[PDB]
Amino acid sequence: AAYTLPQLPYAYDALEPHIDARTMEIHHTKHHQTYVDNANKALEGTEFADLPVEQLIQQLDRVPADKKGALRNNAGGHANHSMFWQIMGQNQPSGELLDAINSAFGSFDAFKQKFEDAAKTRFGSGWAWLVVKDGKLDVVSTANQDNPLMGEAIAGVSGTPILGVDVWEHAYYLNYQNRRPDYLAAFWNVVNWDEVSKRYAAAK
Amino acid sequence: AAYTLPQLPYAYDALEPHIDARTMEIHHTKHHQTYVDNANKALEGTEFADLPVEQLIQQLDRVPADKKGALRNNAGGHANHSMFWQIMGQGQGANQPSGELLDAINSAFGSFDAFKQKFEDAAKTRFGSGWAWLVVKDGKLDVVSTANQDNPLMGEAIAGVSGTPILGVDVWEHAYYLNYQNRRPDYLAAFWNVVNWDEVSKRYAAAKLV
Numbered sequence: 248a249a250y251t252l253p254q255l256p257y258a259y260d261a262l263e264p265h266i267d268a269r270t271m272e273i274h275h276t277k278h279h280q281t282y283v284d285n286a287n288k289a290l291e292g293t294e295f296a297d298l299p300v301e302q303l304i305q306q307l308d309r310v311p312a313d314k315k316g317a318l319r320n321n322a323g324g325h326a327n328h329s330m331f332w333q334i335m336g337q338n339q340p341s342g343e344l345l346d347a348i349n350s351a352f353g354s355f356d357a358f359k360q361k362f363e364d365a366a367k368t369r370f371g372s373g374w375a376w377l378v379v380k381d382g383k384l385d386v387v388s389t390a391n392q393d394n395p396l397m398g399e400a401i402a403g404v405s406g407t408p409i410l411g412v413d414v415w416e417h418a419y420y421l422n423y424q425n426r427r428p429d430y431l432a433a434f435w436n437v438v439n440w441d442e443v444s445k446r447y448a449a450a451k
Numbered sequence: 452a453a454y455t456l457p458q459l460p461y462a463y464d465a466l467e468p469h470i471d472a473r474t475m476e477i478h479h480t481k482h483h484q485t486y487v488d489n490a491n492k493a494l495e496g497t498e499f500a501d502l503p504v505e506q507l508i509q510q511l512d513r514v515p516a517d518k519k520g521a522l523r524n525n526a527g528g529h530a531n532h533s534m535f536w537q538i539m540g541q542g543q544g545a546n547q548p549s550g551e552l553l554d555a556i557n558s559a560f561g562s563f564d565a566f567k568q569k570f571e572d573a574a575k576t577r578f579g580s581g582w583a584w585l586v587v588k589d590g591k592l593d594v595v596s597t598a599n600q601d602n603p604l605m606g607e608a609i610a611g612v613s614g615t616p617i618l619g620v621d622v623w624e625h626a627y628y629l630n631y632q633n634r635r636p637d638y639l640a641a642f643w644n645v646v647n648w649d650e651v652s653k654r655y656a657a658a659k660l661v
Protein backbone atom coordinates (compact mmCIF):
# COMPACT_ATOMS: atom_id res chain seq x y z
CA ALA A 248 0.00 0.00 0.00
CA ALA A 249 3.06 2.26 0.34
CA TYR A 250 3.41 3.21 -3.35
CA THR A 251 1.06 3.38 -6.36
CA LEU A 252 1.81 3.50 -10.09
CA PRO A 253 1.89 7.15 -11.18
CA GLN A 254 -0.13 8.36 -14.14
CA LEU A 255 1.93 9.45 -17.16
CA PRO A 256 1.95 13.19 -18.10
CA TYR A 257 0.94 12.28 -21.69
CA ALA A 258 -0.71 9.51 -23.75
CA TYR A 259 1.19 6.28 -24.55
CA ASP A 260 1.68 7.42 -28.17
CA ALA A 261 2.83 10.99 -27.37
CA LEU A 262 6.55 10.26 -27.81
CA GLU A 263 6.21 8.65 -31.28
CA PRO A 264 8.18 7.96 -33.41
CA HIS A 265 11.00 8.33 -30.85
CA ILE A 266 9.53 5.82 -28.39
CA ASP A 267 6.80 3.47 -29.66
CA ALA A 268 3.41 3.38 -27.91
CA ARG A 269 3.54 -0.38 -27.29
CA THR A 270 6.83 0.02 -25.43
CA MET A 271 5.44 2.94 -23.38
CA GLU A 272 2.41 0.89 -22.27
CA ILE A 273 4.39 -2.24 -21.38
CA HIS A 274 7.19 -0.22 -19.75
CA HIS A 275 4.61 1.56 -17.62
CA THR A 276 1.87 -1.03 -16.90
CA LYS A 277 4.14 -4.09 -16.58
CA HIS A 278 7.73 -3.19 -15.71
CA HIS A 279 7.08 -0.13 -13.53
CA GLN A 280 4.00 -1.78 -11.97
CA THR A 281 6.15 -4.77 -10.97
CA TYR A 282 8.68 -2.55 -9.13
CA VAL A 283 5.82 -0.86 -7.26
CA ASP A 284 4.29 -4.23 -6.29
CA ASN A 285 7.58 -5.72 -5.12
CA ALA A 286 8.68 -2.61 -3.20
CA ASN A 287 5.28 -2.61 -1.44
CA LYS A 288 5.68 -6.28 -0.46
CA ALA A 289 9.19 -5.52 0.87
CA LEU A 290 7.96 -2.51 2.88
CA GLU A 291 5.18 -4.34 4.73
CA GLY A 292 6.13 -4.73 8.40
CA THR A 293 8.87 -2.06 8.32
CA GLU A 294 9.05 1.50 9.69
CA PHE A 295 9.84 2.77 6.17
CA ALA A 296 6.48 2.53 4.34
CA ASP A 297 5.67 6.23 4.95
CA LEU A 298 8.77 7.73 3.30
CA PRO A 299 8.68 9.21 -0.21
CA VAL A 300 10.52 6.75 -2.47
CA GLU A 301 13.36 9.22 -3.20
CA GLN A 302 14.04 9.44 0.55
CA LEU A 303 13.78 5.66 1.11
CA ILE A 304 16.48 4.94 -1.49
CA GLN A 305 18.81 7.26 0.40
CA GLN A 306 18.30 5.16 3.56
CA LEU A 307 19.02 1.67 2.23
CA ASP A 308 21.70 1.11 4.93
CA ARG A 309 19.04 1.62 7.65
CA VAL A 310 16.44 -0.91 6.41
CA PRO A 311 16.44 -4.53 7.67
CA ALA A 312 19.39 -6.45 6.17
CA ASP A 313 17.08 -9.03 4.56
CA LYS A 314 15.01 -6.30 2.86
CA LYS A 315 17.96 -4.28 1.49
CA GLY A 316 18.30 -6.17 -1.81
CA ALA A 317 14.58 -6.14 -2.60
CA LEU A 318 14.24 -2.43 -1.76
CA ARG A 319 17.37 -1.44 -3.68
CA ASN A 320 16.03 -3.17 -6.82
CA ASN A 321 12.36 -2.29 -6.51
CA ALA A 322 12.29 1.04 -4.69
CA GLY A 323 15.13 1.94 -7.08
CA GLY A 324 12.97 0.79 -10.03
CA HIS A 325 10.06 2.87 -8.75
CA ALA A 326 12.15 6.01 -8.13
CA ASN A 327 13.92 5.70 -11.50
CA HIS A 328 10.81 5.21 -13.60
CA SER A 329 8.82 7.85 -11.72
CA MET A 330 11.50 10.41 -12.66
CA PHE A 331 11.87 9.02 -16.20
CA TRP A 332 8.23 9.70 -17.21
CA GLN A 333 8.43 13.25 -15.85
CA ILE A 334 11.67 14.22 -17.62
CA MET A 335 10.14 13.35 -21.00
CA GLY A 336 7.35 15.17 -22.86
CA GLN A 337 5.76 15.52 -26.31
CA ASN A 338 14.86 20.94 -28.13
CA GLN A 339 17.43 22.48 -25.77
CA PRO A 340 17.83 23.80 -22.21
CA SER A 341 18.07 27.52 -21.44
CA GLY A 342 18.65 29.88 -18.48
CA GLU A 343 20.66 28.73 -15.44
CA LEU A 344 20.79 25.07 -16.50
CA LEU A 345 22.28 25.79 -19.93
CA ASP A 346 24.88 27.98 -18.17
CA ALA A 347 25.77 25.11 -15.82
CA ILE A 348 25.95 22.70 -18.78
CA ASN A 349 28.25 25.09 -20.65
CA SER A 350 30.55 25.50 -17.63
CA ALA A 351 30.78 21.81 -16.73
CA PHE A 352 30.88 20.38 -20.26
CA GLY A 353 31.90 23.24 -22.58
CA SER A 354 28.69 23.17 -24.63
CA PHE A 355 25.31 21.42 -24.82
CA ASP A 356 26.57 19.38 -27.79
CA ALA A 357 29.57 18.20 -25.76
CA PHE A 358 27.31 17.32 -22.83
CA LYS A 359 25.16 15.21 -25.18
CA GLN A 360 28.21 13.26 -26.39
CA LYS A 361 29.35 12.63 -22.79
CA PHE A 362 25.84 11.55 -21.73
CA GLU A 363 25.53 9.28 -24.78
CA ASP A 364 28.98 7.78 -24.08
CA ALA A 365 28.01 6.95 -20.50
CA ALA A 366 24.78 5.33 -21.73
CA LYS A 367 26.53 3.39 -24.54
CA THR A 368 29.31 1.99 -22.34
CA ARG A 369 26.93 0.83 -19.58
CA PHE A 370 27.28 -2.94 -20.05
CA GLY A 371 24.13 -4.93 -19.28
CA SER A 372 21.10 -3.22 -17.73
CA GLY A 373 21.13 0.22 -16.13
CA TRP A 374 20.76 3.98 -16.45
CA ALA A 375 22.83 7.02 -17.45
CA TRP A 376 22.42 10.18 -15.36
CA LEU A 377 23.09 13.89 -15.34
CA VAL A 378 23.68 14.64 -11.65
CA VAL A 379 24.37 17.64 -9.42
CA LYS A 380 27.32 16.73 -7.18
CA ASP A 381 28.64 19.42 -4.80
CA GLY A 382 26.82 22.08 -6.88
CA LYS A 383 28.47 20.95 -10.12
CA LEU A 384 27.14 18.86 -13.03
CA ASP A 385 28.51 15.41 -13.92
CA VAL A 386 27.55 12.46 -16.10
CA VAL A 387 27.46 9.01 -14.49
CA SER A 388 25.90 5.58 -15.07
CA THR A 389 24.50 2.95 -12.69
CA ALA A 390 23.73 -0.78 -12.95
CA ASN A 391 20.23 -2.27 -12.97
CA GLN A 392 17.88 -0.09 -10.86
CA ASP A 393 20.56 1.63 -8.79
CA ASN A 394 20.26 5.43 -8.49
CA PRO A 395 23.08 7.92 -7.54
CA LEU A 396 20.90 9.03 -4.56
CA MET A 397 21.71 5.61 -3.09
CA GLY A 398 25.27 6.83 -2.59
CA GLU A 399 28.79 5.66 -3.43
CA ALA A 400 28.81 2.36 -1.53
CA ILE A 401 25.64 0.97 -3.16
CA ALA A 402 25.42 2.67 -6.57
CA GLY A 403 29.13 3.16 -7.34
CA VAL A 404 28.54 6.89 -7.92
CA SER A 405 26.67 9.70 -6.12
CA GLY A 406 24.88 13.04 -6.60
CA THR A 407 21.32 14.20 -7.24
CA PRO A 408 19.97 13.11 -10.64
CA ILE A 409 18.13 15.76 -12.68
CA LEU A 410 17.98 13.74 -15.90
CA GLY A 411 18.26 10.01 -16.63
CA VAL A 412 17.79 7.62 -19.54
CA ASP A 413 16.77 3.97 -19.20
CA VAL A 414 19.16 1.68 -21.14
CA TRP A 415 17.59 -1.60 -20.08
CA GLU A 416 16.82 -3.42 -23.34
CA HIS A 417 13.10 -3.26 -22.50
CA ALA A 418 13.26 0.51 -22.99
CA TYR A 419 14.29 0.26 -26.67
CA TYR A 420 14.22 -3.30 -28.03
CA LEU A 421 10.81 -3.24 -29.73
CA ASN A 422 11.67 -0.17 -31.87
CA TYR A 423 15.49 -0.27 -32.08
CA GLN A 424 16.48 -3.85 -31.27
CA ASN A 425 20.31 -3.85 -30.82
CA ARG A 426 20.63 -0.20 -31.91
CA ARG A 427 20.97 1.47 -28.51
CA PRO A 428 22.85 4.45 -30.03
CA ASP A 429 19.83 5.19 -32.31
CA TYR A 430 17.53 5.09 -29.28
CA LEU A 431 19.88 7.46 -27.45
CA ALA A 432 20.03 9.94 -30.32
CA ALA A 433 16.22 9.94 -30.56
CA PHE A 434 15.86 10.46 -26.78
CA TRP A 435 17.07 14.09 -27.09
CA ASN A 436 13.84 14.83 -29.00
CA VAL A 437 11.63 13.94 -26.03
CA VAL A 438 13.53 15.42 -23.05
CA ASN A 439 11.45 17.94 -21.07
CA TRP A 440 14.14 20.53 -20.32
CA ASP A 441 11.67 22.66 -18.34
CA GLU A 442 11.35 19.80 -15.84
CA VAL A 443 15.12 19.17 -15.78
CA SER A 444 15.66 22.90 -15.02
CA LYS A 445 13.15 22.71 -12.15
CA ARG A 446 15.15 19.79 -10.73
CA TYR A 447 18.48 21.60 -11.18
CA ALA A 448 17.27 24.73 -9.35
CA ALA A 449 15.98 22.42 -6.59
CA ALA A 450 19.22 20.40 -6.30
CA LYS A 451 21.10 23.69 -6.10
CA ALA B 452 41.47 -12.29 -35.72
CA ALA B 453 41.44 -14.48 -32.59
CA TYR B 454 37.77 -15.51 -32.74
CA THR B 455 35.17 -15.86 -35.49
CA LEU B 456 31.36 -16.01 -35.26
CA PRO B 457 30.38 -19.70 -35.22
CA GLN B 458 27.79 -21.05 -37.61
CA LEU B 459 24.56 -22.21 -35.92
CA PRO B 460 23.81 -25.97 -35.91
CA TYR B 461 20.38 -25.19 -37.48
CA ALA B 462 18.55 -22.48 -39.50
CA TYR B 463 17.32 -19.24 -37.86
CA ASP B 464 13.70 -20.44 -37.95
CA ALA B 465 14.51 -23.94 -36.62
CA LEU B 466 13.45 -23.14 -33.03
CA GLU B 467 10.06 -21.64 -34.00
CA PRO B 468 7.66 -20.96 -32.34
CA HIS B 469 9.63 -21.21 -29.06
CA ILE B 470 12.25 -18.66 -30.18
CA ASP B 471 11.46 -16.45 -33.18
CA ALA B 472 13.67 -16.43 -36.30
CA ARG B 473 14.17 -12.64 -36.15
CA THR B 474 15.48 -12.87 -32.59
CA MET B 475 17.80 -15.74 -33.56
CA GLU B 476 19.23 -13.73 -36.48
CA ILE B 477 19.76 -10.50 -34.50
CA HIS B 478 20.98 -12.37 -31.44
CA HIS B 479 23.55 -14.15 -33.65
CA THR B 480 24.60 -11.57 -36.26
CA LYS B 481 24.45 -8.46 -34.08
CA HIS B 482 24.86 -9.36 -30.38
CA HIS B 483 27.17 -12.37 -30.61
CA GLN B 484 29.11 -10.75 -33.50
CA THR B 485 29.69 -7.66 -31.35
CA TYR B 486 31.14 -9.82 -28.53
CA VAL B 487 33.47 -11.51 -31.06
CA ASP B 488 34.59 -8.16 -32.54
CA ASN B 489 35.24 -6.54 -29.17
CA ALA B 490 37.05 -9.58 -27.76
CA ASN B 491 39.24 -9.56 -30.88
CA LYS B 492 40.10 -5.89 -30.26
CA ALA B 493 41.15 -6.56 -26.66
CA LEU B 494 43.22 -9.60 -27.69
CA GLU B 495 45.00 -7.99 -30.66
CA GLY B 496 48.02 -6.84 -28.62
CA THR B 497 48.35 -9.77 -26.17
CA GLU B 498 49.66 -13.33 -25.72
CA PHE B 499 46.11 -14.57 -25.07
CA ALA B 500 44.90 -14.58 -28.69
CA ASP B 501 45.74 -18.28 -29.17
CA LEU B 502 43.74 -19.68 -26.22
CA PRO B 503 40.40 -21.38 -26.72
CA VAL B 504 37.80 -18.94 -25.35
CA GLU B 505 36.73 -21.35 -22.58
CA GLN B 506 40.34 -21.42 -21.33
CA LEU B 507 40.80 -17.65 -21.66
CA ILE B 508 37.82 -16.92 -19.38
CA GLN B 509 39.42 -19.22 -16.78
CA GLN B 510 42.59 -17.09 -16.91
CA LEU B 511 41.22 -13.54 -16.45
CA ASP B 512 43.59 -12.62 -13.58
CA ARG B 513 46.55 -13.28 -15.90
CA VAL B 514 45.44 -10.63 -18.43
CA PRO B 515 46.59 -6.97 -18.23
CA ALA B 516 44.42 -5.05 -15.72
CA ASP B 517 43.33 -2.60 -18.43
CA LYS B 518 42.00 -5.47 -20.61
CA LYS B 519 40.39 -7.48 -17.80
CA GLY B 520 36.94 -5.84 -17.95
CA ALA B 521 36.76 -5.93 -21.75
CA LEU B 522 37.72 -9.61 -21.83
CA ARG B 523 35.42 -10.56 -18.96
CA ASN B 524 32.50 -8.99 -20.86
CA ASN B 525 33.34 -9.88 -24.46
CA ALA B 526 35.24 -13.14 -24.12
CA GLY B 527 32.51 -14.08 -21.62
CA GLY B 528 29.88 -13.03 -24.19
CA HIS B 529 31.53 -15.16 -26.90
CA ALA B 530 31.90 -18.25 -24.63
CA ASN B 531 28.28 -17.96 -23.41
CA HIS B 532 26.61 -17.61 -26.81
CA SER B 533 28.83 -20.23 -28.43
CA MET B 534 27.56 -22.70 -25.82
CA PHE B 535 23.96 -21.43 -26.02
CA TRP B 536 23.63 -22.26 -29.74
CA GLN B 537 25.01 -25.76 -29.22
CA ILE B 538 22.71 -26.72 -26.33
CA MET B 539 19.52 -25.95 -28.29
CA GLY B 540 18.04 -27.89 -31.20
CA GLN B 541 15.01 -28.49 -33.40
CA GLY B 542 12.54 -31.38 -32.97
CA GLN B 543 14.12 -32.33 -29.64
CA GLY B 544 12.73 -35.14 -27.47
CA ALA B 545 7.98 -33.90 -23.75
CA ASN B 546 11.63 -33.00 -24.18
CA GLN B 547 13.78 -34.29 -21.29
CA PRO B 548 17.08 -36.05 -20.65
CA SER B 549 17.52 -39.76 -20.00
CA GLY B 550 20.25 -42.13 -18.79
CA GLU B 551 23.05 -40.98 -16.51
CA LEU B 552 22.15 -37.30 -16.70
CA LEU B 553 18.56 -37.93 -15.66
CA ASP B 554 19.76 -40.15 -12.79
CA ALA B 555 22.01 -37.27 -11.64
CA ILE B 556 19.13 -34.76 -11.87
CA ASN B 557 16.88 -37.09 -9.83
CA SER B 558 19.67 -37.40 -7.27
CA ALA B 559 20.45 -33.66 -7.08
CA PHE B 560 16.99 -32.14 -7.41
CA GLY B 561 14.44 -34.92 -6.75
CA SER B 562 13.08 -35.09 -10.30
CA PHE B 563 13.32 -33.48 -13.70
CA ASP B 564 10.19 -31.44 -12.90
CA ALA B 565 11.74 -30.17 -9.64
CA PHE B 566 14.95 -29.32 -11.52
CA LYS B 567 12.99 -27.31 -14.08
CA GLN B 568 11.34 -25.40 -11.21
CA LYS B 569 14.71 -24.67 -9.59
CA PHE B 570 16.28 -23.62 -12.90
CA GLU B 571 13.31 -21.39 -13.80
CA ASP B 572 13.51 -19.81 -10.31
CA ALA B 573 17.22 -18.98 -10.70
CA ALA B 574 16.51 -17.47 -14.13
CA LYS B 575 13.52 -15.49 -12.83
CA THR B 576 15.38 -14.07 -9.83
CA ARG B 577 18.39 -12.94 -11.88
CA PHE B 578 17.76 -9.19 -11.68
CA GLY B 579 18.93 -7.23 -14.73
CA SER B 580 20.92 -9.00 -17.46
CA GLY B 581 22.55 -12.41 -17.06
CA TRP B 582 22.34 -16.19 -17.40
CA ALA B 583 21.07 -19.17 -15.42
CA TRP B 584 23.18 -22.32 -15.47
CA LEU B 585 23.17 -26.02 -14.70
CA VAL B 586 26.74 -26.71 -13.49
CA VAL B 587 28.79 -29.69 -12.36
CA LYS B 588 30.61 -28.63 -9.21
CA ASP B 589 32.76 -31.26 -7.45
CA GLY B 590 30.98 -34.03 -9.37
CA LYS B 591 27.53 -32.81 -8.31
CA LEU B 592 24.83 -30.82 -10.12
CA ASP B 593 23.76 -27.35 -8.98
CA VAL B 594 21.74 -24.46 -10.41
CA VAL B 595 23.33 -20.98 -10.27
CA SER B 596 23.04 -17.62 -12.03
CA THR B 597 25.46 -14.97 -13.26
CA ALA B 598 25.34 -11.24 -14.03
CA ASN B 599 25.82 -9.85 -17.55
CA GLN B 600 28.25 -12.06 -19.52
CA ASP B 601 29.87 -13.70 -16.51
CA ASN B 602 30.29 -17.48 -16.65
CA PRO B 603 30.81 -19.94 -13.75
CA LEU B 604 34.14 -21.03 -15.39
CA MET B 605 35.53 -17.60 -14.45
CA GLY B 606 35.49 -18.76 -10.82
CA GLU B 607 33.78 -17.52 -7.68
CA ALA B 608 35.79 -14.30 -7.24
CA ILE B 609 34.76 -12.88 -10.64
CA ALA B 610 31.37 -14.51 -11.33
CA GLY B 611 30.13 -15.01 -7.77
CA VAL B 612 29.59 -18.74 -8.46
CA SER B 613 31.56 -21.69 -9.88
CA GLY B 614 31.41 -25.10 -11.57
CA THR B 615 31.44 -26.34 -15.17
CA PRO B 616 28.31 -25.28 -17.07
CA ILE B 617 26.55 -27.96 -19.09
CA LEU B 618 23.37 -25.98 -19.78
CA GLY B 619 22.61 -22.25 -19.75
CA VAL B 620 19.77 -19.94 -20.71
CA ASP B 621 20.27 -16.32 -21.78
CA VAL B 622 17.98 -13.97 -19.78
CA TRP B 623 19.21 -10.70 -21.25
CA GLU B 624 16.04 -9.05 -22.52
CA HIS B 625 17.39 -9.18 -26.11
CA ALA B 626 17.05 -13.00 -25.89
CA TYR B 627 13.24 -12.85 -25.43
CA TYR B 628 11.81 -9.32 -25.77
CA LEU B 629 10.63 -9.43 -29.41
CA ASN B 630 8.54 -12.61 -28.87
CA TYR B 631 7.68 -12.41 -25.13
CA GLN B 632 8.26 -8.79 -24.06
CA ASN B 633 8.11 -8.64 -20.22
CA ARG B 634 7.01 -12.30 -19.98
CA ARG B 635 10.34 -13.88 -19.04
CA PRO B 636 8.53 -16.85 -17.37
CA ASP B 637 6.78 -17.65 -20.72
CA TYR B 638 10.19 -17.60 -22.44
CA LEU B 639 11.62 -19.92 -19.78
CA ALA B 640 8.73 -22.39 -20.19
CA ALA B 641 9.20 -22.40 -24.01
CA PHE B 642 12.98 -22.91 -23.61
CA TRP B 643 12.45 -26.48 -22.37
CA ASN B 644 11.12 -27.41 -25.84
CA VAL B 645 14.41 -26.57 -27.56
CA VAL B 646 17.05 -27.95 -25.16
CA ASN B 647 19.34 -30.48 -26.84
CA TRP B 648 19.68 -32.99 -24.01
CA ASP B 649 22.01 -35.22 -26.07
CA GLU B 650 24.51 -32.33 -26.11
CA VAL B 651 23.92 -31.56 -22.41
CA SER B 652 24.48 -35.28 -21.62
CA LYS B 653 27.74 -35.22 -23.64
CA ARG B 654 28.92 -32.23 -21.55
CA TYR B 655 27.82 -33.92 -18.30
CA ALA B 656 29.73 -37.14 -19.09
CA ALA B 657 32.88 -35.12 -19.83
CA ALA B 658 32.57 -32.93 -16.71
CA LYS B 659 32.23 -36.03 -14.50
CA LEU B 660 35.46 -37.52 -15.90
CA VAL B 661 37.29 -35.14 -13.50
Ligand SMILES: [Fe+3]
Pocket residue numbers: 274278328413415417418
Ligand atom coordinates in the same frame (compact mmCIF):
# COMPACT_ATOMS: atom_id res chain seq x y z
FE1 LIG C 1 12.77 0.46 -17.50
Ligand SMILES: [Fe+3]
Pocket residue numbers: 478482532621623625626
Ligand atom coordinates in the same frame (compact mmCIF):
# COMPACT_ATOMS: atom_id res chain seq x y z
FE1 LIG D 1 22.41 -12.94 -25.63
